[PDB]
Structures are given as C-alpha cells and as structure tokens.
Amino acid sequence: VIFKKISRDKSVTIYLGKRDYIDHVERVEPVDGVVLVDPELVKGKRVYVSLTCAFRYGGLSFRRDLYFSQVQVFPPVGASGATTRLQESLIKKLGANTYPFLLTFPDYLPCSVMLQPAPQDVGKSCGVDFEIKAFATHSTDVEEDKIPKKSSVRLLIEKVQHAPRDMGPQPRAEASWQFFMSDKPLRLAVSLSKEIYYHGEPIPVTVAVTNSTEKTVKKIKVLVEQVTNVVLYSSDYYIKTVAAEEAQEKVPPNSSLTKTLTLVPLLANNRERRGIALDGKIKHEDTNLASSTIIKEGIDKTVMGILVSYQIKVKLTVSGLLGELTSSEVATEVPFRLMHPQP
C-alpha cells in the first residue's frame, strides 16, 4: 500500500511504498521512495531526505543516533543510481517535480523494539525508532541553514527481523541435582526441535527427567521467558513469562519420564503489555513481541541499545522429605531465537 505525507506548507510531499522494511540478516531492504515538490515554493531552496535510527530512553531524556544518512534530492545532484519499479511508477504518475531517493540500512543496526515499564520496574520508557524525513532548507542575509517546520515531513518506519537462510545447532540442555543429605541425583535433559522459531509457531520442548531421588517430582512446568537488557544509558533488566504449560503428570521416586510440551509465545497470551519488549506502539494492534536481537559478529553489543532474547525454562517442583518444611524447586534454561519467517 503506497502511502504519502504532505508538509504543512504543501511544498514537500513524500511517498513511500511500504512502512515495514525486512532485515533478514543477509541484507536489509533499502528505503526507496520519492519526493514531490512544489517548484514555486522550493525555489531557491534545497530539499533533503534523511534516514535516522535512534535509541531513546525516557523530563529526563537520552537519545543516540545509531545510524544517520542524508541525501539531496533537490536540486538534483545526478548521483541517485538506478531507479526501482516503485520509483519509476510514482515518477511517471505524479509528474515532473518528482525526485527519487534511496536510503540503505547498514548491517550493524537492531530492529524495531519498544519497551514501556511496569509499576514494579525501576526503568524508564525506551526504544529504537526509525524515521524518514524530507525537508526544505534555505539561507538568507540574516540567517543560514534555516529549516522551517512547515517545509518538512516525517514518517516513522519499521525494521522487521526475518529468519536468515541458515540456523543454529539444535538447542540442548542437561542439568543434574544432588540435594542435601543424599548423593542420589535428579537429572533433566531438555531439547527443542530447532533453534529458530517464528512468531506464532509451536515450540516442542522435549523433557527427560531421570529421578533417582527419594523425592517426588510433584510438578513439571515449562515457560517461555523473554529476557531483555537495556544496554545504553541505563542498565535495565527485564524478564517476563510470555508462555507457560504444565505437564499434568508427576515423577515418583526412582522413576523416569519423557514428555513433549508445546509452547507458543504470543503477546496476546497476556493482557499486560508492560515490562515487555515489543516491536511497535504498545497500544497498537498488530504489535508483537520483539524478535530476538541478532548481534552480528565483531560488533559491540551496546550499539544495539536493547538486547532481546528468548529461553525455554523447565522448572521441576520436588517434594520435601520427612523433616523438611517446604517443597523445593530446581530449574534449567535453554536459549532460542524468535523472529518472522524467511522472505
């Protein structure tokens, strides 16, 4: 759906073909668009188009430009390169005051992520925004580099994480426990079907409990936890359960059990959207859980602003022996990556 935005003084209008731009690790879809100007109003002026990736935190406020690119589209510079089908269409259709622009993403950026704090959280609101801006600027004998608000337009865009071609090794885990006063172990092996999952895709967690203890494994709980780490400006940490299933089955003393439970991590699983890393405005409707942060090798993690990750957590609730006051709970975790399907 081709969408446009006109400036207040109607001098600079900007057209884009889409709002979501696909990052699939291998490459990122460039921002190809067009700018229709009113030659009467932009006469003697210059019109630029900019791409900005900013991390914001927060009145108290912090902002870091994770990436910035800018080009002049009027008057023309003559170095635009080959035009795309969308650009050619829009130019041939809108008239002659139409000037194409192409703004590429680098490979060291994160994707669109927003985070609003919950009452039990000490962190402030933060996120990563992507913004395209077309503006007209000019100088005079009294002022230079004057950019009036009326001669400019902004468009918020999305940068969406999609699965790359390859994929990590099969997620596996193994934890063993020896409790107080007994060298008898409780072993727990956990495997996932694959290392990358898609938003909405069922996640098969295979759980193998080898219980050599005199204790009873009263409960087997499997969660999908979203761990999020703000890594710029303030060191905030969040961890929320976004999916949960129990086994409805126990493991008696000196017993073994292997079962498969299927978790689907969805934002719709909890009405509470706060304290969770999302991929859009916390009140919109197509907002999903943020995709796993894919940190490219050699890059310093802090330039991602917000690190998002997902893990399967297997919790075992074991019974107390004679003399013990309460039950006990042990747990293990196995990481995995969540994102949108391949292009």
Residue numbers in the entry: 11 to 68, 76 to 360
Q: Could you give the paper's own sentences about this structure?
A:
Members of arrestin family play a central role in the regulation of signaling and trafficking of G protein-coupled receptors (GPCRs). Visual arrestin-1 (arr-1) is proposed to exist in basal or inactive form that gets activated upon interaction with light-activated, phosphorylated rhodopsin (P-Rh*). Thus, an intact polar core and the three-element interactions are the constraints that keep arrestin in its inactive state.
Here, residues R175 and D296 form the central salt bridge in the polar core and charge reversal of these residues results in arrestins that bind to the non-phosphorylated, activated receptor. R175E crystallized in space group P212121, with one molecule per asymmetric unit. The structure was solved by molecular replacement method as described in methods, which could be refined up to 2.7 Å resolution. Residues 1–10 (N-terminus), 69–75 (loop V-VI or finger loop) and 361–404 (C-terminal residues including the C-tail) could not be traced in the electron density maps and thus are likely to be disordered. R175 forms a central salt bridge, restrained by D296 and D30. Superposition of R175E on arr-1 shows that the gate loop is pushed away from the central residue 175 of the polar core (Cα R/E 175E – Cα D303 distance is 10.6 Å and 12.2 Å in arr-1 and R175E, respectively). Interestingly, the side chain of R29 is disordered in R175E as it could not be traced in the electron density map beyond the Cβ position. Crystallization of R175E was performed without any ligand. The structure of R175E presented here is the first structure report of an arrestin with mutation in the polar core that shows a completely disrupted hydrogen bond network in the polar core, a 7.5° rotation between N- and C- domains, and a ‘free’ C-tail.
